[PDB]
Amino acid sequence: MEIKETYDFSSIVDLWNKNIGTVYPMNLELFKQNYINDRQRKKIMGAFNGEILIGFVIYKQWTYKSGSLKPNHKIGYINSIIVDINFRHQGIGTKLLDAAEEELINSGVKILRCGSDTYHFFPGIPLECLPSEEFFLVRGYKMQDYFYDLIGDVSKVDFKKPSIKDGFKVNVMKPEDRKGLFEFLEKSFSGRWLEEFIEFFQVGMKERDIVLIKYKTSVIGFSHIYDNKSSFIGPPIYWKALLGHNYGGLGPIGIDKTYRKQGLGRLLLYESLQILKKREVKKMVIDWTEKDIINFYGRFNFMPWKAYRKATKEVKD
Amino acid sequence: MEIKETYDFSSIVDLWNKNIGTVYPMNLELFKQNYINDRQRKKIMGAFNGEILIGFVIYKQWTYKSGSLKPNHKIGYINSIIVDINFRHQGIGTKLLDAAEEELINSGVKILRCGSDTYHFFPGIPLECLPSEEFFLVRGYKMQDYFYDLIGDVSKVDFKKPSIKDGFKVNVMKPEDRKGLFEFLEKSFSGRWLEEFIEFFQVGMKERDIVLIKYKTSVIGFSHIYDNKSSFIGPPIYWKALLGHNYGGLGPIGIDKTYRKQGLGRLLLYESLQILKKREVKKMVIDWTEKDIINFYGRFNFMPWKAYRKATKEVKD
Numbered sequence: 001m002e003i004k005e006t007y008d009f010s011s012i013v014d015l016w017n018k019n020i021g022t023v024y025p026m027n028l029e030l031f032k033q034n035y036i037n038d039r040q041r042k043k044i045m046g047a048f049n050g051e052i053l054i055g056f057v058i059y060k061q062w063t064y065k066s067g068s069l070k071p072n073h074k075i076g077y078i079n080s081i082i083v084d085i086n087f088r089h090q091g092i093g094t095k096l097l098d099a100a101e102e103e104l105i106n107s108g109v110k111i112l113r114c115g116s117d118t119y120h121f122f123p124g125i126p127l128e129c130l131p132s133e134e135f136f137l138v139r140g141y142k143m144q145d146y147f148y149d150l151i152g153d154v155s156k157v158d159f160k161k162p163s164i165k166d167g168f169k170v171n172v173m174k175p176e177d178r179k180g181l182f183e184f185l186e187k188s189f190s191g192r193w194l195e196e197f198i199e200f201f202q203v204g205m206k207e208r209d210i211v212l213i214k215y216k217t218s219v220i221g222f223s224h225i226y227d228n229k230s231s232f233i234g235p236p237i238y239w240k241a242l243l244g245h246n247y248g249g250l251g252p253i254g255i256d257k258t259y260r261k262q263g264l265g266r267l268l269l270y271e272s273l274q275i276l277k278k279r280e281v282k283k284m285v286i287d288w289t290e291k292d293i294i295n296f297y298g299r300f301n302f303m304p305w306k307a308y309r310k311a312t313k314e315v316k317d
Numbered sequence: 318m319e320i321k322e323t324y325d326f327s328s329i330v331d332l333w334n335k336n337i338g339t340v341y342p343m344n345l346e347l348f349k350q351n352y353i354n355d356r357q358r359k360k361i362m363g364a365f366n367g368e369i370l371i372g373f374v375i376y377k378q379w380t381y382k383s384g385s386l387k388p389n390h391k392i393g394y395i396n397s398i399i400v401d402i403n404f405r406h407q408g409i410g411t412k413l414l415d416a417a418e419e420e421l422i423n424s425g426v427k428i429l430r431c432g433s434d435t436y437h438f439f440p441g442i443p444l445e446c447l448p449s450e451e452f453f454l455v456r457g458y459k460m461q462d463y464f465y466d467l468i469g470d471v472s473k474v475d476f477k478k479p480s481i482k483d484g485f486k487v488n489v490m491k492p493e494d495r496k497g498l499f500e501f502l503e504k505s506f507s508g509r510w511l512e513e514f515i516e517f518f519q520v521g522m523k524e525r526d527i528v529l530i531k532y533k534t535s536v537i538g539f540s541h542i543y544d545n546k547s548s549f550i551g552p553p554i555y556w557k558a559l560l561g562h563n564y565g566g567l568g569p570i571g572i573d574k575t576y577r578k579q580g581l582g583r584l585l586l587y588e589s590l591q592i593l594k595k596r597e598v599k600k601m602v603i604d605w606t607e608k609d610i611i612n613f614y615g616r617f618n619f620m621p622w623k624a625y626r627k628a629t630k631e632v633k634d
């Protein structure tokens with residue numbers, strides 16, 4: 001058995017699907033999109049029996065800015081690790097993660113996170129991979145709180161328009177709105193979401209995918225929406241194979257702090273969903289939510305669908 | 318708004334699907350199977366706006382034996398409660414559960430359980446219904462541990478036959494095995510599983526659905542298996558709409574205590590799965606498992622799919 005780098009994406013994807021594809025169906029388009037476009041220091045290590053891939057780990061170090069947030073080389077990520085089902089409990093996962101962690105640690109990492117990376121597949125350890133929590137515990141990862149993807153079928157329900165407030169309007173973005181959108185994100189959401197806007201527009205996101213809420217002429221909020229015409233495969237539609245025909249998704253969604261708790265997020269969400277409904281969307285996902293916000297979406301008939309556990313290892317000095 | 322009994326199953330099923338059907342798709346066949354065949358004291362209460370059903374609760378008291386286990390009138394169950402999405406936070410769920418609980422309490426109930434009933438839909442409060450945990454907490458239910466349904470696609474993986482032990486053979490049940498199966502269940506699994514065998518054979522379970530493990534001529538274990546030819550819709554295939562073509566399922570599965578921790582459960586599981594694989598089963602479910610046993614099935618490529626929280630209210634004296 002040898003551990004070495006591999007970029008045989010077809011082999012990786014086939015191993016992914018055989019092992020966890022029932023609940024996380026992967027396609028090469030998504031895999032290559034997210035791996036190749038990532039700007040961080042990154043690597044894929046495989047375990048091989050001769051020519052045959054039997055396991056892999058994908059790992060990264062935070063070396064590229066996220067919007068106004070400078071990179072922190074102390075942070076590393078385990079994007080994904082899978083050992084083939086016919087080769088478990090032979091120490092292969094330990095060998096792959098030892099290789100990954102040692103490389104990270106030598107390059108300055110002090111905090112190792114499970115998922116949650118840029119161009120992630122997972123916000124954290126999936127509930128479907130609950131048994132892996134013990135694997136990570138043995139290595140010194142600590143298990144923390146949960147995040148949830150939510151699912152709803154917007155074709156099935158009609159909602160009341162929230163009572164509008166004068167001056168506030170919600171519309172799909174136009175090209176001429178970009179300046180104002182970026183000024184808004186620099187003020188209000190200047191970290192990962194700013195970076196995501198910059199990056200996703202480079203990899204095929206279009207104005208039709210963004211909804212803006214304005215007070216007079218000023219952008220005060222946004223949402224990202226997805227349907228089966230989106231070119232960029234973002235997190236809400238990673239798992240679109242599970243979602244049937246006319247899938248869709250929403251997220252992120254944000255309102256300027258000084259405008260919060262006035263009904264404007266509800267208005268933004270309502271209008272965004274109406275856009276998707278009119279686009280003939282059926283099942284759709286809201287990704288990577290915290291427990292305390294679920295009921296905001298639950299009012300629109302969304303339910304927790306997938307759960308992920310945050311987990312972090314502090315490198316011993 | 319009025320609360321009264323309703324047995325308009327089509328209306329109930331339509332409300333179920335509109336509200337939670339994305340993740341718990343209900344069909345009338347299953348609904349009627351499980352409601353009508355249940356032997357406990359049972360009722361369905363609906364909330365109505367005139368002729369229109371806007372919510373329901375299904376509830377039961379333990380009044381009929383489970384195998385050798387006598388009924389305990391102190392135990393009541395909330396089988397399911399759903400308020401329509403357009404009528405939430407108006408007190409309707411409180412009114413339905415107040416009606417149910419008061420009836421139960423007057424008839425002697427001291428312990429109220431969320432799900433886990435005979436002919437249940439849910440082992441406990443589904444993770445997809447996590448927000449309802451707060452609804453039940455306000456009423457004095459306490460949240461306990463979790464159970465999991467597991468999912469696997471048996472068409473995708475080949476396993477090694479476990480090393481057989483002489484004298485032990487695994488085969489689909491024949492009609493002439495029934496006596497020995499029931500003597501075995503009376504000795505080893507004489508509660509709910511015994512009752513389920515008795516009842517499920519009345520409602521369409523067939524010998525082809527049962528696998529037996531024998532030591533010489535003596536039954537020492539069994540499993541229940543399901544495919545798209547099963548007549549009885551048991552828990553592993555409740556949610557078969559999510560499972561695609563050639564769905565299946567397994568559970569329960571049990572070995573005589575004195576024969577445990579010798580490899581025989583693994584052998585039983587392997588052979589049961591080989592039966593399903595040869596029947597051309599693809600995605601299949603193992604229902605209502607405890608965390609400590611997941612890895613037993615995980616070796617065969619099964620992963621947690623759905624999670625449910627046990628919850629119980631102790632009636633204040």
Ligand SMILES: CC(=O)SCCNC(=O)CCNC(=O)[C@H](O)C(C)(C)COP(=O)(O)OP(=O)(O)OC[C@H]1O[C@@H](n2cnc3c(N)ncnc32)[C@H](O)[C@@H]1OP(=O)(O)O
Pocket residue numbers: 019020078079080081082083084087088089090091092093094095114115122124125126129130131132134135138612615
């Ligand atoms: C950020 C993320 O990627 S989260 C998703 C993680 N990946 C998955 O869950 C995919 C499915 N699972 C797998 O691919 C594997 O089970 C892995 C990668 C978790 C572990 O790979 P393996 O090669 O089997 O692990 P390895 O043999 O090195 O395990 C070492 C120790 O970890 C612990 N461990 C590993 N798997 C488990 C498990 N399922 N349950 C409990 N402990 C375990 C044990 O202590 C084990 O030692 P043991 O064999 O003496 O019991």
Ligand SMILES: CC(=O)SCCNC(=O)CCNC(=O)[C@H](O)C(C)(C)COP(=O)(O)OP(=O)(O)OC[C@H]1O[C@@H](n2cnc3c(N)ncnc32)[C@H](O)[C@@H]1OP(=O)(O)O
Pocket residue numbers: 295298336337395396397398399400401404405406407408409410411412431432439441442443446447448449451452455
């Ligand atoms: C055994 C089982 O059936 S488990 C599955 C339970 N059912 C579901 O989850 C289906 C989907 N949900 C529903 O149908 C509803 O949300 C129900 C049945 C849980 C509650 O119905 P409602 O009519 O909205 O509840 P009702 O208005 O009586 O709620 C009373 C109090 O419960 C608490 N509560 C109810 N819903 C929630 C929620 N989503 N989050 C937090 N607390 C809540 C609140 O304290 C609420 O008072 P409030 O309105 O002042 O905040």
Ligand SMILES: O=S(=O)(O)CCCN1CCN(CCO)CC1
Pocket residue numbers: 147188189190191192193194288289290
């Ligand atoms: O772009 S910003 O980093 O300034 C704003 C980030 C806000 N959210 C990031 C991801 N989480 C995940 C949980 O929903 C919530 C907060």
Ligand SMILES: O=S(=O)(O)CCCN1CCN(CCO)CC1
Pocket residue numbers: 464505506507508509510511605606607
């Ligand atoms: O039929 S018996 O009641 O004697 C045996 C019951 C055994 N199991 C019942 C249901 N649970 C649920 C968790 O898997 C496990 C124990």
Ligand SMILES: CC(=O)N[C@@H]1[C@@H](O)[C@H](O)[C@@H](CO)O[C@H]1O
Pocket residue numbers: 192193196235250251252253254286287288289
């Ligand atoms: C509902 C929501 O806003 N969720 C977003 C998610 O869409 C996004 O993929 C992630 C990472 O940027 O940040 C979460 O907070």
Ligand SMILES: CC(=O)N[C@@H]1[C@@H](O)[C@H](O)[C@@H](CO)O[C@H]1O
Pocket residue numbers: 509510513552567568569570571603604605606
């Ligand atoms: C894997 C397993 O045995 N799970 C069974 C389940 O199949 C059955 O529906 C339930 C209620 O009898 O009891 C569980 O213990």
